[PDB]
């Protein structure tokens, strides 16, 4: 109802008229919590690492504190 | 438009010793008195969580313990540091178990590799378990609601913990431990 | 019309009755809501006010049952905004921010985004951002918040002083994206064409002292300013060293392990590793000793798991000891009574906090409230910890209310017409109710003449006369009925041991002996080694 | 430890404690079991406060809201010291029954409310305050004479004003609401099982995955046994 | 210890009253027989110490040096004077001083006293 | 047309479980279903008796 931005209230109705004339050649709002009851069953990807500047990339601590797989 | 402003950081792995192993549980307890039994040491390290015990060496005046979850291990390391047992300040840190100790001691004489092998993980999702919690004693059909503790460990059997019966059992063993402890049967 | 056509439908009756039968599911609430919205689909100002009143009361009644839902405060705000009244939108944003104690990143971001359009008077608009900053500013993902705020300065402000002012603060925060703002800072250093514009960074004195560069310098300036940009970029590289270190630690240890940042429902379960990483992340945050980021990381950790009581207890502990704030701890436990399902540990620790805070009318009131929950039978409760925690703190109160009735000045704690009838009603149920011996052991604690006579006659004697089998087969009963006579200070040794042997013991039936002997031997083995034989000859 | 000699002593050394602070509002709620006991203490208290500076709002569904506004510092020193001691006296010395005379060996504790807009040790402000638009302050255990000094030093710093007229009515609304919620929460306590949850579908959903989480545990026990030995 | 603290908590609630209770706290130190056993339960070394100077001596303590990782004491770089406490509204008064650092050389220096190897494997 | 009901206040035996005016926590239900609604909870009450 919020982040899909097509089905919202404030911006929702406008996107329809903003659709191109599409001359030639989805995430519905009705979803509930009942789908995906357990958010983790081999579904999610872990959060992407924070980025780093290309210039100063040699600044990074060389070695991690723990052993990742 | 070849190079980019930002990259994901890449970083080296720290050789995998028992100190950099994120799964390590067993805590090496050094500086004992060697007047102490193992059932007394269990009394010290019991409340920090459920224990899968390993051993206390003889004559070496240093033991070690092993918990199920690392949170209980760290709670024990921070909980007891420098805590005297039989009038000896205890110094405890991370250390491996008995078999990996054997694999190390065979290498110490032959000074070859000493390649560590990390502890096994718990294969983690688990929605029923709440780390650092004990089942104080042993038919249960529960609601499996979030607040209650669903699964647990036994001092090797996974048991479903009944929230009502667990408190009265733990208090029962608590009031027994006083009467037996005062007269010398339990120590 | 559409309203009445919606009432007479069967789906509204079924969905509704499901909601009212099962309030905390949140599955039936969301179906009831998604349906009544779709019936109204031309939701603009034309639709009749009865239907809008129903859908609105449906939102407002759902958000009360589930005080943490961010996308629903947002969604109901947007409904009120499309409907044409922004004041109701403001108010219910304030309501959502208040439900989270003013710290939630989504409600502040999605709020201020709304606030940019509907609010003139630049000063007040920025006061919204300064209020948001001191709360949610240090959140690990808050960078996009700052991206709004910086975006609002450069558009509003002609001076550019405030952009350097704020971006300089953003440099020192260990966010998830720090580098985005370091690129803006480095670029804005690169675009400085005059010495006079270096006073925007820092004042005139710190530049001449720490970095030894002069703005008033008169001569060929160009290479001097090129030296000054290098000397200014070095220290920014150092700040980048520290803040990078902090971010990479926080991600590599904790934030990478956290897969769920949101509330879900009261029926959700969270994985054990996620619990462990929230615990350790909270200990680390406590170690940083940043109070704003500490309360933030508790409230941040609180919405993913609100129903356990786990983080409620800790968040009462760090605030009761580290900060040494006892009222704040009481208030934490009170707000924890609502969300947490188990409630027993929170209400015990809460009894203690109220005791130390020295509010007795509040504690005794709350005991009245919890006994009124069960319709004035706490003694019949299935879960024993509630009856026990209730009974001992109730005891501590009626000791203070009523003066002691007994000689030696001993207060009557558990022996009173009010409480002893409660205890005896608890004991009359025998096998069906759990607590039993635990309640009985504390009836032996009196250690005097009057009270050993009282507890002797009024329970241990009557329980023999009524002759219940559960209590007679039990060894804890006979062990405690020996320890009650044996620790009396009035009796000598001779009448004590002679009383235990000549009377207490022969009242045991020989068929019960097999169960009674192990526990009753433990009393005789330690205290009476001499008479151990006449014990063995009986059984 | 008598309130009048101590109140004159704070009159002398407080550096102009006579004047009243602009837009000054103070709210202390309290609950008392005996209405007959408290009504006479408050009645004897209204004598010197002239009923405009101090007003007592009862809440009946015993809870009294004590509202003290447009007050001089020396006045709050008097009143809060009276009330906070009267609240302990019922439990401590019920035989005393002298309102202005504080019996010995009683430390003053309690909490009071001020508006969220105030511009600034025994008296401490709390983190995580419940009532949304207000801020509550704790008074740690203290002797009366110490409490006069700490409070007199506290109200010298705080400079505040510009409050809406009926704000007290907002305080009643919020404060009654917060405890209505915890009462409603304690009434949800016994009925957690099956009453409002719809447990049937919940067990049907969670049981298969909890069984698997158990299988992974009994797998982890053996997998650890092979690691240790 | 958990046993004496819990059993004494119950015993004290049952056999005592408030008049005895509130007279029993010195307040020089924070101690109450109801609440203190609940804070002291899993903590043997818990000391209810109220001091402001623990703030001054902070960040040299082993709890700071190991925070997110236990047993391993890193030296972590930090800015000596950090602005993240001051709100942006209070910054615009005066120009912000340049950051003073500390512990910035040791970013890669991470030390462990290995107590398992040298006192056991080495003997 | 519609009644506002609080199953918490109802199961807790408290008086105000229903009202005609909209209050914070109540659930709107059809008036004719109100009686029906009571039926749905009776067994819960029957378990407490």
Q: What's the rounded Cα separation, in Å, for the pair E13 and C397?
A: 9
> Is residue E64 within 8 Å of residue E75, measured between CB atoms?
no
B15 min Cα distance to partner chain A (Å): 8
Q: What's the rounded Cα separation, in Å, for the pair C120 and C122?
A: 6
Please state the three-class secondary structure of C330-371 as a single string. HHHHHHHHHHCCCCHHHHHHHHHHHHHHCCHHHHHHHHHHHH
SS3 D68: strand
| Both structure tokens of C276 | 């462990």
> Is residue C419 within 8 Å of residue C391, measured between CB atoms?
yes
Burial class of residue D169 (count of CB atoms within 10 Å of its CB; 0-12, 13-18, 19+): exposed
Cβ atoms within 10 Å of C535's Cβ, excluding its own:
17
The residue count of chain B comes to 187
- Which site among E65, E71, E108 would you substitute to test the A interface, given the most A Cβ atoms closer than 10 Å to its Cβ? E108
SS3 F4: strand
> Is residue C462 within 8 Å of residue C477, measured between CB atoms?
no
Buried residues in C13-23 as b, exposed as e (16+ CB within 10 A): bebbbbbbbbb
Q: What's the rounded Cα separation, in Å, for the pair C440 and C458?
A: 13
Kindly report each contact of residues E9-14 with a partner whose C-beta sits within 8 Å and lies 24 or more positions away, as own/partner. E9/E33, E9/E34, E9/E37, E9/E38, E10/C392, E10/C442, E11/C445, E13/C392, E13/C393, E13/C395, E13/C396, E14/C392, E14/C395, E14/C396, E14/C413, E14/C414, E14/C442, E14/C445
> Is residue A53 within 8 Å of residue C182, measured between CB atoms?
yes
Residue D31 has its nearest CB partner, among C334, C343, C361, at C361
**Is C244 close to A38, i.e. CB distance below 8 A?**
no
B110 min Cα distance to partner chain A (Å): 26
E118 min Cα distance to partner chain D (Å): 21
Q: Which chains touch D (3 or more CB pairs under 8 A)?
A: A, B, C, E, F
> Is residue D89 within 8 Å of residue E4, measured between CB atoms?
no
**Is B13 close to A53, i.e. CB distance below 8 A?**
no
Buried residues in B127-146 as b, exposed as e (16+ CB within 10 A): bbbbbbbbbbeeeeebbbbb
Taking CA atoms, B27 is separated from B65, C368, C388, in Å, by 5, 47, 37
Burial class of residue B187 (count of CB atoms within 10 Å of its CB; 0-12, 13-18, 19+): exposed
SS3 B64: strand
Quickly tell me which residue has 């010793």 as its tokens. Answer: B17
| Both structure tokens of E2 | 């958990």
Helix %, strand %, coil % of chain A (to 5): 15, 5, 80
Q: What's the rounded Cα separation, in Å, for the pair C350 and C330?
A: 7
Q: What's the rounded Cα separation, in Å, for the pair A50 and A57?
A: 13
Quickly tell me which residue has 């307890």 as its tokens. Answer: B29
CA atoms within 13 A on the CB side of D95: 1
Question: DSSP character for D21?
Answer: P
D197: Cβ–Cβ under 8 A, 6 or more apart, which residues?
Answer: B143, B145, C22, C24, C25, C266, C267
Name beta bridge partners: B51: B67
Q: What's the rounded Cα separation, in Å, for the pair A52 and A58?
A: 10
Phi then psi dihedrals of residue C441, to 5 deg:
-60, -40
| Both structure tokens of E25 | 């706290």
Quickly tell me which residue has 């019309």 as its tokens. Answer: C1
Identify the H or E element spanning D30: strand D25-31
Q: What's the rounded Cα separation, in Å, for the pair C33 and C61?
A: 11
> Is residue F3 within 8 Å of residue F20, measured between CB atoms?
yes
Q: What's the rounded Cα separation, in Å, for the pair D138 and D123?
A: 6
Question: DSSP character for E100?
Answer: P
> Is residue C15 within 8 Å of residue C32, measured between CB atoms?
yes
C536: Cβ–Cβ under 8 A, 6 or more apart, which residues?
Answer: none
Q: What is the DSSP string of B143-187?
A: ---SSS--EEE----EEEPPHHHHHHHHHHHHHHHHHHHHHTS--
Residues of chain D contacting E31 with CB distance shorter than 8 Å: none
Quickly tell me which residue has 């102490």 as its tokens. Answer: B36
Q: If you measure CA to CA, which chain A residue comes closest to B8?
A: A51
**Is D195 close to F14, i.e. CB distance below 8 A?**
no
Taking CA atoms, C264 is separated from C21, C305, C360, in Å, by 21, 9, 38
Identify the H or E element spanning C316: helix C310-320
| Both structure tokens of D179 | 């405890």
Q: What was the structure determination method?
A: cryo-EM
> Is residue C293 within 8 Å of residue C137, measured between CB atoms?
no
Q: What's the rounded Cα separation, in Å, for the pair F31 and F10?
A: 16
Residue B174 has its nearest CB partner, among E3, E43, E44, at E3
N-to-C CA span, chain D: 71
| Both structure tokens of D136 | 């509550």
Q: What's the rounded Cα separation, in Å, for the pair C192 and C172?
A: 22
Q: Which chains touch F (3 or more CB pairs under 8 A)?
A: C, D
CA atoms within 13 A on the CB side of C421: 4
Buried residues in B20-51 as b, exposed as e (16+ CB within 10 A): bbbebbbbbbbbbeeebeeeebebbbbbbbbb
Name beta bridge partners: D2: D101
Q: Where are the alpha helices (DSSP H) in C222-306?
A: 222-253, 272-288, 291-302
Name beta bridge partners: D69: D25
Q: What's the rounded Cα separation, in Å, for the pair D51 and A66?
A: 68
Residues of chain A contacting E74 with CB distance shorter than 8 Å: 65
D30: Cβ–Cβ under 8 A, 6 or more apart, which residues?
Answer: C361, D63, D64, D66, D83, D87, D110
SS3 D29: strand
C212: Cβ–Cβ under 8 A, 6 or more apart, which residues?
Answer: none
Chain centroid, CA F15 distance in Å: 10
Number of alpha helices (DSSP H) and beta strands (DSSP E) in chain A: 1, 1
Q: What's the rounded Cα separation, in Å, for the pair C153 and C125?
A: 11
Burial class of residue E60 (count of CB atoms within 10 Å of its CB; 0-12, 13-18, 19+): exposed
Q: If you measure CA to CA, which chain B residue comes closest to D226?
A: B99
> Is residue C131 within 8 Å of residue C121, measured between CB atoms?
no
Name beta bridge partners: A52: B7
A37 min Cα distance to partner chain D (Å): 8
Q: What's the rounded Cα separation, in Å, for the pair C51 and C246?
A: 53
Resolution to 1 decimal, in Å?
3.4
Q: If you measure CA to CA, which chain A residue comes closest to D205?
A: A37
Burial class of residue D89 (count of CB atoms within 10 Å of its CB; 0-12, 13-18, 19+): buried
Q: What's the rounded Cα separation, in Å, for the pair C257 and C103?
A: 22
Chain centroid, CA C330 distance in Å: 11
Number of alpha helices (DSSP H) and beta strands (DSSP E) in chain C: 29, 0
Phi then psi dihedrals of residue E73, to 5 deg:
-100, 105
Name where chain D breaks: residue before each gap, C-N > 2.5 Å: 61, 120
Q: What's the rounded Cα separation, in Å, for the pair D141 and D106?
A: 9
Phi then psi dihedrals of residue B163, to 5 deg:
-65, -30
CA atoms within 13 A on the CB side of C42: 6
Strands B27-30 and B91-94: antiparallel
N-to-C CA span, chain B: 74
| The dihedral formed by the CA atoms of C345, C347, C352 and C357, expressed in degrees to the nearest 10 | 140
| Both structure tokens of A42 | 């081999």
Q: What's the rounded Cα separation, in Å, for the pair C309 and C305?
A: 9
**Is C307 close to B129, i.e. CB distance below 8 A?**
no
Q: What angle do CA C442, C448, C454 make, to 5 degrees?
A: 70
Residue C392 has its nearest CB partner, among E13, E68, E95, at E13
| The dihedral formed by the CA atoms of C338, C343, C345 and C348, expressed in degrees to the nearest 10 | 80
| Both structure tokens of B139 | 């038919």
Q: What's the rounded Cα separation, in Å, for the pair C426 and C419?
A: 10
Question: DSSP character for C102?
Answer: T
Within an 8 Å CB–CB cutoff, is residue D185 touching chain B?
no
Identify the H or E element spanning C538: helix C532-538
Question: DSSP character for A45?
Answer: P
E34: Cβ–Cβ under 8 A, 6 or more apart, which residues?
Answer: C351, C352, C355, C356, C396, E9, E12, E13, E21
Question: DSSP character for A47?
Answer: P
**Is E74 close to A63, i.e. CB distance below 8 A?**
no
Q: What angle do CA A38, A43, A45 make, to 5 degrees?
A: 125
Residue (of C168, C166, C119, C156) closest to E89 by Cα position: C166
Within an 8 Å CB–CB cutoff, is residue C182 touching chain A?
yes
Taking CA atoms, E100 is separated from B27, C211, C232, C235, in Å, by 39, 12, 14, 9
Q: If you measure CA to CA, which chain E residue comes closest to B49?
A: E42
- Which site among E65, E120, E121 would you substitute to test the B interface, given the most B Cβ atoms closer than 10 Å to its Cβ? E120
SS3 A41: coil
Residues of chain D contacting F14 with CB distance shorter than 8 Å: 187
Q: What's the rounded Cα separation, in Å, for the pair C125 and C119?
A: 7
| Both structure tokens of C438 | 């635990």
Q: What's the rounded Cα separation, in Å, for the pair C405 and C107?
A: 59
SS3 B120: coil
Q: What's the rounded Cα separation, in Å, for the pair D112 and D147?
A: 14
N-to-C CA span, chain A: 38
Name beta bridge partners: A53: B6
Q: What's the rounded Cα separation, in Å, for the pair C182 and A53?
A: 8
Phi then psi dihedrals of residue C246, to 5 deg:
-60, -45
> Is residue C108 within 8 Å of residue C96, measured between CB atoms?
no
Identify the H or E element spanning D59: strand D54-59
| Both structure tokens of A32 | 């509930």
Question: DSSP character for C304?
Answer: T
Q: What's the rounded Cα separation, in Å, for the pair E81 and F31?
A: 66
Q: Do chains C and A touch (3 or more CB pairs under 8 A)?
A: yes
**Is B129 close to C526, i.e. CB distance below 8 A?**
no
Within an 8 Å CB–CB cutoff, is residue C382 touching chain B?
yes
Q: What's the rounded Cα separation, in Å, for the pair B184 and B182?
A: 6
Phi then psi dihedrals of residue C48, to 5 deg:
-65, 150
D181 min Cα distance to partner chain C (Å): 7
| Both structure tokens of B6 | 């930002």
| Both structure tokens of E115 | 């107590």
Cβ atoms within 10 Å of E2's Cβ, excluding its own:
15
> Is residue D87 within 8 Å of residue D30, measured between CB atoms?
yes
The residue count of chain C comes to 539
| Both structure tokens of D92 | 């401590």
Residues of chain A contacting E72 with CB distance shorter than 8 Å: 65
Please state the three-class secondary structure of D103-155 as a single string. CCCCCEEEEEEEECCCECCCEEECCCCCCCCEEEEEEEEECHHHHHHHHHHHH
| Both structure tokens of C71 | 């996308």
- Packing angle of the helix pair D3-13, D73-92 (nearest 10 deg): 150
Quickly tell me which residue has 């300036």 as its tokens. Answer: C221
SS3 E52: coil
């Amino acid at each position: 109802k919020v982040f899909v931005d097509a089905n919202r209230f404030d911006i929702g109705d406008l996107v329809k008229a903003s659709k191109l004339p599409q001359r030639a050649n989805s995430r519905s709002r009705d979803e509930t919590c009942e789908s995906n009851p357990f958010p983790r069953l081999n579904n999610p990807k872990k959060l992407e690492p924070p980025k780093i500047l290309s210039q100063w990339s040699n600044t990074i601590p060389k070695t991690s504190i723990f052993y990742s797989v | 438009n070849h190079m980019s402003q930002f990259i994901y950081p890449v970083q080296q792995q720290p050789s995998l010793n028992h100190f950099t192993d994120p799964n390590n549980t067993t805590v090496f307890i050094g500086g004992l008195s060697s007047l102490v039994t193992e059932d007394e040491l269990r009394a010290y390290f019991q409340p920090f969580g459920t224990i899968v015990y390993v051993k206390i060496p003889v004559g070496k005046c240093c033991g070690f313990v092993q918990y199920v979850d690392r949170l209980s291990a760290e709670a024990a390391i921070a909980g007891m540091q420098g805590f005297p047992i039989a009038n000896s300040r205890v110094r405890l840190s991370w250390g491996r178990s008995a078999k990996q100790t054997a694999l190390l001691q065979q290498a110490m004489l032959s000074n070859s590799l000493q390649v560590q092998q990390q502890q096994p993980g718990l294969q983690q999702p688990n929605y029923g378990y709440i780390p650092s919690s004990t089942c104080e004693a042993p038919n249960v059909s529960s609601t499996m609601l979030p607040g209650c503790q669903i699964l647990n460990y036994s001092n090797g059997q996974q048991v479903i913990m009944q929230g009502s019966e667990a408190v009265v059992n733990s208090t029962n063993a608590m009031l027994n431990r006083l009467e037996q402890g005062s007269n010398g049967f339990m120590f | 019309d559409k309203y009445t056509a919606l009432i007479h439908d069967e789906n509204f009756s079924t969905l509704t009755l499901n909601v009212s039968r099962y309030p905390k599911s949140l599955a039936y609430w969301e179906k009831l809501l998604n349906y009544i919205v779709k019936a109204s689909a031309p939701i603009c100002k034309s639709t009749e006010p009865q239907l809008l009143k129903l859908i609105r009361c449906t939102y407002s009644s759902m958000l009360n049952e589930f005080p943490y839902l961010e996308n629903y405060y947002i969604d109901f705000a947007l409904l009120e905004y499309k409907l044409g009244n922004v004041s109701m939108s403001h108010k219910i944003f304030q309501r959502g921010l208040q439900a989270f104690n003013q710290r939630s990143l989504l409600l502040w971001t999605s709020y201020l985004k709304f606030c940019n359009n509907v609010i003139s008077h630049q000063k007040q608009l920025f006061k919204k951002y300064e209020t948001a900053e001191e709360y949610v500013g240090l959140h690990f993902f808050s960078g996009e918040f700052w991206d709004l705020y910086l975006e609002q300065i450069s558009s509003r402000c002609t001076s550019s002083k405030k952009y350097w002012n704020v971006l300089r603060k953003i440099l020192e925060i260990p966010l998830h994206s720090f580098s985005k703002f370091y690129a803006l800072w480095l670029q804005r250093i690169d675009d400085i064409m005059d010495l006079k514009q270096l006073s925007q960074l820092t004042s005139k004195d710190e530049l001449l002292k720490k970095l030894k560069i002069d703005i008033n310098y008169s001569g060929r300036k160009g290479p001097y300013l090129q030296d000054a940009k290098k000397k200014l970029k070095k220290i920014t590289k150092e700040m980048y060293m520290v803040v990078q270190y902090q971010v990479l630690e926080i991600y590599s240890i904790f934030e990478s392990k956290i897969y769920i940042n949101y509330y879900t429902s009261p029926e959700t379960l969270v994985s054990s590793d996620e619990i462990e990483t929230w615990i350790k992340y909270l200990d680390y945050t406590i170690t940083l000793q940043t109070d704003s980021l500490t309360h933030l990381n508790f409230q941040r950790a609180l919405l993913p798991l609100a129903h356990y009581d786990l983080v409620w207890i800790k968040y009462s502990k760090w605030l009761i000891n580290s900060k040494n704030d006892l009222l704040g701890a009481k208030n934490v436990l009170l707000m924890g009574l609502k969300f947490s399902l188990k409630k027993t540990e929170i209400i015990k620790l809460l009894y203690s906090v109220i005791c130390k805070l020295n509010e007795y009318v509040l504690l005794r009131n709350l005991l009245e409230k919890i006994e009124s929950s069960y319709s004035d039978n706490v003694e019949n409760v299935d879960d024993f910890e509630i009856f026990w925690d209730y009974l001992q703190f109730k005891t501590f109160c009626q000791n203070s209310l009523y003066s002691s009735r007994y000689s030696d000045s001993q207060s009557n704690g558990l022996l009173n017409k009010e409480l002893f009838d409660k205890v005896w009603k608890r004991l009359s149920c025998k096998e069906k109710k759990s607590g039993q011996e635990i309640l009985l052991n504390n009836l032996v604690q009196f250690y005097s003449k009057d009270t050993v006579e009282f507890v002797e006659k009024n329970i241990f004697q009557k329980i023999i006369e009524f002759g219940w089998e559960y209590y007679l087969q039990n060894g804890m009963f006979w062990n405690c009925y020996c320890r009650l006579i044996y620790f009396d200070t009035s009796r000598s040794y001779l009448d004590k041991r002679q009383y235990i042997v000549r009377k207490i013991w022969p009242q045991i039936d020989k068929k019960f002996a097999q169960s009674v002997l192990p526990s009753l031997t433990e009393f005789c083995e330690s205290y009476f080694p001499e008479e151990m034989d006449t014990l063995e000859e009986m059984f | 430890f008598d309130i009048w000699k101590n109140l004159d002593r704070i009159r002398s050394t407080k550096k102009n404690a006579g004047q009243f602070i602009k837009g000054s509002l103070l709210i202390l709620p309290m609950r008392t079991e005996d209405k007959q006991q408290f009504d006479e203490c408050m009645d004897e208290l209204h004598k010197y406060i002239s009923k405009d500076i101090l007003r007592c709002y009862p809440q009946k569904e015993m809870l009294f809201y004590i509202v003290l506004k447009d007050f001089n510092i020396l006045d709050s020193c008097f009143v809060l010291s009276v009330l906070l001691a009267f609240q302990k006296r019922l439990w401590m010395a019920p035989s005393e029954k002298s309102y202005f005379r504080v019996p010995k060996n009683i430390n003053l504790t309690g909490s009071f409310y001020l508006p969220k807009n105030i511009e600034t040790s025994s008296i401490v402000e709390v983190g995580f305050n419940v009532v949304p638009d207000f801020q509550q302050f704790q008074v740690k255990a203290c002797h009366v004479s110490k409490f006069m000094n700490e409070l007199s030093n506290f109200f010298s710093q705080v400079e505040f004003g510009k409050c809406e007229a009926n704000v007290i009515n907002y305080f009643k609304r919020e404060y009654n609401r917060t405890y209505s919620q915890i009462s409603l929460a304690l009434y949800e306590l016994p009925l957690i099982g099956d009453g409002l949850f719809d447990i049937k579908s919940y067990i049907s959903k969670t049981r298969p995955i909890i069984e698997t989480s158990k299988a992974q545990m009994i797998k982890h026990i053996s997998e650890m046994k092979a690691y240790n030995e | 210890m958990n046993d004496i603290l819990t059993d004494y908590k119950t015993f004290y609630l049952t056999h005592s009253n408030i008049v005895t209770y509130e007279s029993s706290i010195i307040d020089s130190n924070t101690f109450d027989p109801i609440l203190y056993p609940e804070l002291k339960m899993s903590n043997p070394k818990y000391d209810p110490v109220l001091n402001t100077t623990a703030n001054v001596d902070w960040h040299k303590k082993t709890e700071w040096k190991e925070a997110g990782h236990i047993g391993i004491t890193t030296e972590r770089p930090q800015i000596s004077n950090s602005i993240i406490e001051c709100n942006s509204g209070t910054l615009i008064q005066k120009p912000i001083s340049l950051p003073n650092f500390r512990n910035l050389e040791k970013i890669n220096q991470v030390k462990i006293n290995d107590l398992y190897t040298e006192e056991f494997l080495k003997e | 047309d519609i009644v506002f009901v609080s199953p918490q206040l109802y199961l807790s035996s408290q008086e105000g479980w229903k009202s005609d005016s909209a209050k914070s926590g109540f659930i709107p239900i059809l008036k004719n279903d109100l009686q029906r609604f009571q039926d749905s909870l009776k067994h819960i009450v029957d378990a407490r008796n």
